[PDB]
Amino acid sequence: QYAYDFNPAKTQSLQSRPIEHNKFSAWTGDQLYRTSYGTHWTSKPQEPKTHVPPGYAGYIPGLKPNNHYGASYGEIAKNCLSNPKVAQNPFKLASTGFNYQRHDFRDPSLTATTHKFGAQTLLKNHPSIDQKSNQWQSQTHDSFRNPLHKPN
Amino acid sequence: MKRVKESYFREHSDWSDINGCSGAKEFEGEDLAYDARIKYQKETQKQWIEQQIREKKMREEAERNEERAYA
Amino acid sequence: FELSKGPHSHKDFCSTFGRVSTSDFRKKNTGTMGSNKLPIIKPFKYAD
Amino acid sequence: MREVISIHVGQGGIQVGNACWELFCLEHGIQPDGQMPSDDDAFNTFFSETGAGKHVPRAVFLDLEPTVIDEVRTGTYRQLFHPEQLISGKEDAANNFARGHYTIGKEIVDLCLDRIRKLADNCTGLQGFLVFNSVGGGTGSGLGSLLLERLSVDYGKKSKLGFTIYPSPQVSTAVVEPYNSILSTHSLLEHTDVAVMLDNEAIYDICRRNLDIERPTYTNLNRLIAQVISSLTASLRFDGALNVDITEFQTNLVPYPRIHFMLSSYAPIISAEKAYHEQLSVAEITNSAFEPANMMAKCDPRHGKYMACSMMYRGDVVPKDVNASIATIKTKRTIQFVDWCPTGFKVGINYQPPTVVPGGDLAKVMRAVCMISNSTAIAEVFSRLDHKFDLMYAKRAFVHWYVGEGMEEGEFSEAREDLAALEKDYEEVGIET
Amino acid sequence: YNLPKTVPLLPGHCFPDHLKESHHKTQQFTLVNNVHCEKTNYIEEKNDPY
Amino acid sequence: MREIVHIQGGQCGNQIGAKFWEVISDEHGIDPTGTYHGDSDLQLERINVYYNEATGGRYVPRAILMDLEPGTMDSVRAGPFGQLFRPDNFVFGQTGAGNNWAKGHYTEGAELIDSVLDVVRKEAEGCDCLQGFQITHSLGGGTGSGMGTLLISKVREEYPDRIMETFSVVPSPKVSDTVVEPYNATLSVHQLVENADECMVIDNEALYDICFRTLKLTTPTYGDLNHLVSAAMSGVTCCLRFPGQLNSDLRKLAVNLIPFPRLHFFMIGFAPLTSRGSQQYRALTVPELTQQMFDAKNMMCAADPRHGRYLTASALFRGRMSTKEVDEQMLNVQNKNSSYFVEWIPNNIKSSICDIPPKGLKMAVTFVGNSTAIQEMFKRVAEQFTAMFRRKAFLHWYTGEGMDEMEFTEAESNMNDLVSEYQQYQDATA
Amino acid sequence: MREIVHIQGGQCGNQIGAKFWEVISDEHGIDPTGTYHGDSDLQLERINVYYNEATGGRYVPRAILMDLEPGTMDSVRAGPFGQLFRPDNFVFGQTGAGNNWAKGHYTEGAELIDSVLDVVRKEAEGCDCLQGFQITHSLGGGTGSGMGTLLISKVREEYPDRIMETFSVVPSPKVSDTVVEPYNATLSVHQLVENADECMVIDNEALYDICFRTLKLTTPTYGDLNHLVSAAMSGVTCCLRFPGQLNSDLRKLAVNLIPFPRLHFFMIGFAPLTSRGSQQYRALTVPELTQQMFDAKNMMCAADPRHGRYLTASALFRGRMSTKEVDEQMLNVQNKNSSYFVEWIPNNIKSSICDIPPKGLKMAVTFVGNSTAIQEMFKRVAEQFTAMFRRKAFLHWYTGEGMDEMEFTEAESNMNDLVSEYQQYQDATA
Ligand SMILES: Nc1nc2c(ncn2[C@@H]2O[C@H](COP(=O)(O)OP(=O)(O)OP(=O)(O)O)[C@@H](O)[C@H]2O)c(=O)[nH]1
Ligand SMILES: Nc1nc2c(ncn2[C@@H]2O[C@H](COP(=O)(O)OP(=O)(O)O)[C@@H](O)[C@H]2O)c(=O)[nH]1
Ligand SMILES: Nc1nc2c(ncn2[C@@H]2O[C@H](COP(=O)(O)OP(=O)(O)O)[C@@H](O)[C@H]2O)c(=O)[nH]1
Ligand SMILES: [Mg+2]
């Protein structure tokens, strides 16, 4: 009838089977998942924190750079956590470093020492229009969030 | 602490239930419910194993999923 | 207290990563598989 | 009216108190946020009403390494505990008992005692303190010693219990832990009312043999110790036909003031794959409790005499079956009691069935037994730790790490002597008249 | 019935033949500087825009 | 459980292992890419005996290949089923052997064997509960008969409790394959006799005779010879891997087979074997199998067993048969030929049964025998050695790297003595 | 809390840091522009340990680059991740040391070191709670091996309670890159033994051997070598930055690894490392991790470990695993090799677990082993130093900046005494 064949079930080579593609993170659905808690109630990575109790210690981002004025520690933490930024890429650089030459490092005046000046103004990380009085900012009447609302 | 239950399974009796019992004729310690009681409880007890078996089996399958992904 | 062990045991000096002449060889029957000779007789107790 | 205060120090103490407090909340029906869902004063032993809704535990957490405490306050139980009773330092003692007893613990002991005062003044019928500590760790041992010595004079006759976790005979984590273990033992000998042995190897063997889990983790152990504590303490917050308290331990299990180290056992511990495929009768569970391989401490009771046994049954057990089992235990020859103890059994019975935690391993059974034995076989672990300590102390290894932190060089000598005196007392008591 | 679709190997069924067009032996195993090393055949892919 | 690791050396060992491994892979239903594709559940219960585990659920053999020249392993890697073995399991030199026992045992093997020792010892500590080692080599070559024997000795001083088996291809002079074969043969046997727990001898002349007369096929090849000996290899250990009425592992075989420690040489055979033109006339039954096993020509050794008396023998059956037929046929053959069995032991035959037959067959059987007739090979090789050593021919090659004639004298004396006590038991009476 | 600052000097140290900061930025999800891009909350919780925060939401490493010549700094600035470092942190001379220990430790380094000491003092005072300092440098070069060590001494005798860790690239003699290596290596070790809390020795030859034998990649380079060193560097402090079953910081490792004050020279190792031809075949389990960790060829030093007895060992695991397997495997490897573990300190291995593995893997192992086998490197260095110093070769060059040979004699006597007393404990018995 016929001779002897080697491969059963006609398994095609992983060599020529399709092409590689972007599921590098196939296993890292839970790679940044603690187990001190975790695996006690949940099995999926914890959502980012929004509130912290007093004396939380490690590095709430907002506080140190721009000195936050007189307000409760938890209040400041909640504000500077719920604020935007602290994430998302406008430049779209990767954390690995393979994408370093996608974006050229530019700092958006013409310095000229021929006759006068040449000091150049400061960088665009300082306030405008927001100049407003402290008694004004601190002293408003009721048009705030309700301190004790929490709908049930 | 307190002694609320005379025995684990049954509470105290209502005053109407204890009508005589001045003479040692009714003790209530004779059950008349023991065999049916154990027969009933064993069934719910097998049920606890039954549910626990699916819980453990699902946990094991979830564990195996991770190795499948990492491969 | 003793825990006498027979065939395999678990203690070794040179198990995993130990290892760092033409004149010398095995003479006649030093090998374990040779030496067709038996030990000496003991009356023995049994009954205990 | 009756309360007990929990003290947790060290990474082991924190990671076991976590499982203990999860189990307590689940048993009393308290949601993780601290309030009864959205749809009885027995909780009062462990918790206290704030008046408006939620309940705050009567416990304190201590550490010098902020990672664990930060992890707690980031977890889901963040709203449960009071924000300022989870005391965390800045620098870890780094397995050094001298650092935790003379250098850095003294700046945190004052805050801890202040919190203990602010917590104890609230209670009115204070039963006692429980303490959890890893004995083989620097900060754990040092801070445990400091708190026990401070409390012994601050409160006096109040009962204190210690659930110490001694190093295993052959497998362990650190290499310097015998020094800390011996020093802490010297400290606790004259300062704790009750000590319970909880070495890891015995629990490892129990889990491997019975749970049929080939790759267990610290969480399973913590769940087992939590279950043991709950079984011990259920007699103050549940009704029972025959009740026992904390004060009903030093009155039944302590033949002499120096002898207060006991070792525990639990039954039944069966995986749900074969859990109820046997009848789980009171006789067989109480026999498995006394079986030597079941003991929660890596010791063989067959090598010594029995001093006293306290057994707590919970569930659907009945006193007549308890006595019937006791008769068989006394009849059995493999186990023998000391000469001067005609009867050595104290029995407590409770009606609350054990509760099961989701994601757990054990099966929720109608009947369970937890056994605490004081026996003369305990000397073996002390003997082997003694050998391990003297082996290194012969050549003065690692001695500089303790001399340079303010500890006098001869402090080792009297700890060694006190261990020797402990074997003195134990082997002297163990002989017949 | 279910007859075997192919030959099952037995002491008298393999029937090897050595009549090929050309017999050449490929040098796969390489020892350099007292270190064993191999050619990476059966592992090469071709190209992609990644 | 009670798994065995495989190690092979030389061209002979490499080819034999290459054939044996594809035989085992076919038996266990493993594809050339290492992924199981079998149908029955029993094929996966005891798979850890010969195969390890990898990520992705694939299997790799626990085999080690050693050589002084990478030519043989280079040829075998490109063959079918060549992707199962691992590159770290290959160890190779760069100088060759030159068919010199001293070269392969004192100067290059001595400095090369460290790596292969590391590999095999790593595998041994990796496996859960080791059962023993099996070797495949030929004594007529340099690298094999030197380095394999040295490795045997070394692993013996390290694992004295484990079992050791060798498949030894002794040279018969009619197939004169190497002029300097007597030196290598006598030294190799001398070294082997005090270390190897079991040895089974294979003769190329016997294989040639089997292929010519039994299979009756025109053009046999070394592939066919290797496949025969590989079937013989798998037959002895089938019982350890598959269930049966009576379990029997190599330790039990040794215990029931060798009476005295200095007699651990066996001669083997396999059944059934039929030609294409004689499979339609032969019936397949236990009497046929038991008739074919004891046939003198069917034996896989040049020795003629009817010239001597069987000391002990053993049979390993495969398939579903009846202990009725097994035992009654064995008693029948032991009773009708009483002259060919030594008198001071009755029931000198061990029998074992495994219920899984080889693929494509109903019943099979493997015969292994310790009989006093193998002394013919030893006597003949001894007379060859002494005749060609009387004139000190070829001796300078061995002497040039430190060896001395006193070791030659001791080895030949040991072999002669072994012949003496091995023969004196033939005439022993009760 | 308990954060550390980075100081690096010489071209070797600069190249090490160039990849160390790269891998740390990858681990914490920081772009080349310094903006946070982390994917979970973990990459941001403890980021203050290595990174300072700046207005505008950007991050700056707390690193100090310190050197006598600007070529390597100006080259490393232009590479990827080269914009992170603050321009003020660069301190550089204009001449260089010319591989003179004298030039790099007395005449120009001491003059330049005022500014770098000022900036290090500023950085240390700015951060709230110090943990210690870590340095990377090579001992075969003048400017590094002198001026880095002078800074080591100055920093130590200001902050004796803070821990000091050093990664020293000691020069193997088989592949020598500078002919005056023994002189400045001896002069550097003499100063290092008196002030460094932990010294971790790294051998270029050992890295070369690892790159050939394990990865089996054809053309490795200094980039891959630096990346290996950086991975080993991060494996030590990973558990300081991530939560785990058992936290273990630098002070804990120091307490648990050095029995005596002068024995603080460590050999490290990283696992798993496998060739891409074998990445699909090895199965990641704790037994494989520990087997590769304790392998002799996997050590980052030319000192062969099995020439002596391990004084102490430490293992740091990264990933989520059962403490069962870690502890039982460690006990097994300790029991199976009782010959190579000193017996008067039982249970001489410490272990730690961290929950966050390196990106792209589930399990990783970092090993630090204090063993007596490292005395070979000191013996060889001393032999070369005394052979070269007996004829006063190259000696006028060091004596031409005020140095005298009595310092050479003092340093060589110090190393000789260290070797003698370090071997003293090898043969000690109970
Ligand atoms: N059963 C159990 N044992 C633990 C646990 N945590 C720590 N241990 C034991 O504690 C010993 C080390 O001490 P740790 O508790 O980890 O640390 P510490 O007590 O806080 O002391 P430091 O390390 O100096 O901070 C280990 O050998 C463990 O056996 C735990 O959660 N469960
Ligand atoms: N049965 C069998 N015998 C072989 C094979 N290859 C070689 N031989 C025999 O081995 C002898 C030569 O052995 P040799 O190659 O020198 O062994 P080596 O030195 O270890 O490589 C010859 O007599 C051959 O008959 C084989 O594949 N099968
Ligand atoms: N690992 C590693 N070693 C290096 C590198 N560059 C140089 N080396 C080693 O450093 C030694 C020479 O050091 P040298 O340049 O004199 O150091 P310097 O005096 O501080 O500039 C050589 O032996 C090299 O092996 C590198 O990029 N990586
Ligand atoms: Mg700790």
Coordinates of N, CA and C in Angstrom, one line a residue, chain G residues 367-421:
Chain G
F367 N 22.6 35.9 43.3 CA 23.3 35.1 44.3 C 24.6 35.9 44.7
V368 N 24.8 35.9 46.0 CA 26.1 36.5 46.5 C 26.7 35.5 47.5
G369 N 27.9 35.1 47.1 CA 28.5 34.0 48.0 C 29.9 34.4 48.5
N370 N 30.0 34.5 49.8 CA 31.3 34.7 50.4 C 32.0 33.4 50.7
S371 N 33.0 33.1 49.9 CA 33.7 31.8 49.9 C 35.2 32.1 50.0
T372 N 35.9 31.1 50.5 CA 37.4 31.1 50.7 C 38.1 30.9 49.4
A373 N 37.4 30.5 48.3 CA 38.0 30.3 47.0 C 38.6 31.5 46.3
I374 N 38.2 32.7 46.8 CA 38.6 33.9 46.1 C 40.1 34.3 46.5
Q375 N 40.7 33.5 47.4 CA 42.0 33.8 47.8 C 43.0 33.6 46.6
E376 N 42.6 32.8 45.6 CA 43.4 32.6 44.5 C 43.7 33.8 43.7
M377 N 42.7 34.7 43.5 CA 42.9 35.9 42.8 C 43.9 36.8 43.6
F378 N 43.8 36.9 44.9 CA 44.7 37.7 45.7 C 46.1 37.1 45.6
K379 N 46.2 35.8 45.6 CA 47.5 35.1 45.5 C 48.2 35.4 44.2
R380 N 47.5 35.3 43.1 CA 48.0 35.6 41.8 C 48.4 37.0 41.7
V381 N 47.6 38.0 42.2 CA 47.9 39.4 42.1 C 49.2 39.7 42.9
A382 N 49.3 39.1 44.1 CA 50.5 39.3 44.9 C 51.7 38.7 44.2
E383 N 51.6 37.5 43.6 CA 52.7 36.9 42.9 C 53.2 37.8 41.8
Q384 N 52.3 38.3 41.0 CA 52.7 39.2 39.9 C 53.3 40.5 40.4
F385 N 52.7 41.1 41.5 CA 53.2 42.3 42.1 C 54.6 42.1 42.6
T386 N 54.9 41.1 43.4 CA 56.2 40.9 43.9 C 57.2 40.5 42.8
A387 N 56.8 39.8 41.8 CA 57.8 39.5 40.7 C 58.1 40.8 40.0
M388 N 57.2 41.7 39.7 CA 57.5 42.9 39.0 C 58.2 43.9 39.9
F389 N 58.0 43.8 41.2 CA 58.6 44.8 42.1 C 60.0 44.4 42.6
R390 N 60.3 43.1 42.4 CA 61.7 42.7 42.8 C 62.8 43.4 42.0
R391 N 62.5 43.7 40.7 CA 63.4 44.4 39.9 C 63.2 45.9 39.8
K392 N 62.2 46.4 40.6 CA 61.9 47.8 40.7 C 61.4 48.3 39.3
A393 N 60.7 47.5 38.5 CA 60.2 47.9 37.2 C 59.1 48.9 37.4
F394 N 59.1 50.0 36.5 CA 58.1 51.0 36.5 C 58.1 51.8 37.8
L395 N 59.0 51.6 38.7 CA 58.9 52.1 40.1 C 59.2 53.6 40.1
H396 N 60.1 54.1 39.3 CA 60.5 55.5 39.3 C 59.3 56.4 39.0
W397 N 58.4 55.8 38.2 CA 57.2 56.6 37.8 C 56.3 56.9 39.0
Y398 N 56.1 55.9 39.8 CA 55.3 56.2 41.1 C 56.1 57.0 42.1
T399 N 57.4 56.8 42.1 CA 58.2 57.5 43.1 C 58.4 59.0 42.6
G400 N 58.1 59.3 41.4 CA 58.2 60.6 40.9 C 57.1 61.6 41.2
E401 N 56.2 61.2 42.0 CA 55.2 62.1 42.6 C 55.1 62.0 44.1
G402 N 56.3 61.8 44.7 CA 56.4 61.8 46.1 C 56.1 60.5 46.8
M403 N 55.7 59.5 46.1 CA 55.4 58.2 46.8 C 56.8 57.5 47.0
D404 N 56.7 56.6 48.0 CA 57.9 55.8 48.4 C 57.6 54.3 48.4
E405 N 58.6 53.5 48.2 CA 58.4 52.0 48.1 C 57.9 51.4 49.4
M406 N 57.9 52.2 50.5 CA 57.5 51.7 51.8 C 56.0 51.5 51.8
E407 N 55.3 52.4 51.1 CA 53.9 52.1 50.9 C 53.6 50.9 50.1
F408 N 54.4 50.6 49.1 CA 54.2 49.3 48.4 C 54.5 48.1 49.3
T409 N 55.5 48.2 50.1 CA 55.8 47.1 51.1 C 54.6 47.0 52.1
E410 N 54.1 48.1 52.6 CA 53.0 48.1 53.5 C 51.8 47.5 52.9
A411 N 51.4 47.8 51.7 CA 50.3 47.3 51.0 C 50.4 45.8 50.7
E412 N 51.6 45.4 50.3 CA 51.8 44.0 50.0 C 51.7 43.1 51.2
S413 N 52.3 43.7 52.4 CA 52.2 43.0 53.6 C 50.7 42.9 54.1
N414 N 49.9 44.0 53.9 CA 48.5 43.9 54.2 C 47.8 42.8 53.4
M415 N 48.0 42.8 52.1 CA 47.4 41.7 51.3 C 47.9 40.3 51.7
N416 N 49.1 40.2 52.0 CA 49.7 38.9 52.4 C 49.0 38.4 53.8
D417 N 48.9 39.4 54.7 CA 48.2 39.0 56.0 C 46.8 38.7 55.8
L418 N 46.1 39.5 54.9 CA 44.7 39.2 54.6 C 44.5 37.8 54.0
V419 N 45.4 37.4 53.1 CA 45.3 36.1 52.5 C 45.6 35.0 53.5
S420 N 46.6 35.2 54.4 CA 46.9 34.2 55.4 C 45.7 34.0 56.3
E421 N 45.2 35.1 56.9 CA 44.1 35.0 57.8 C 42.8 34.6 57.1

